Amino acid sequence: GIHKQKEKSRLQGGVLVNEILNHMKRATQIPSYKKLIMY
């Protein structure tokens, strides 16, 4: 049952949103977390 219940609207095309992950990659290379040492 990969498909779960829904509460809000959602159309097939909406799946496109997944593309977000791609762009997210960029940030994944350097998030806004807390840094201490570089070496």
Distance CA 14, CA 17 (A): 6
Distance CA 14, CA 1 (A): 20
Experimental method: NMR
CA-only gyration radius of the chain, Å: 17
Phi, psi of 14, deg, nearest 5: -50, -35
Distance CA 14, CA 38 (A): 40
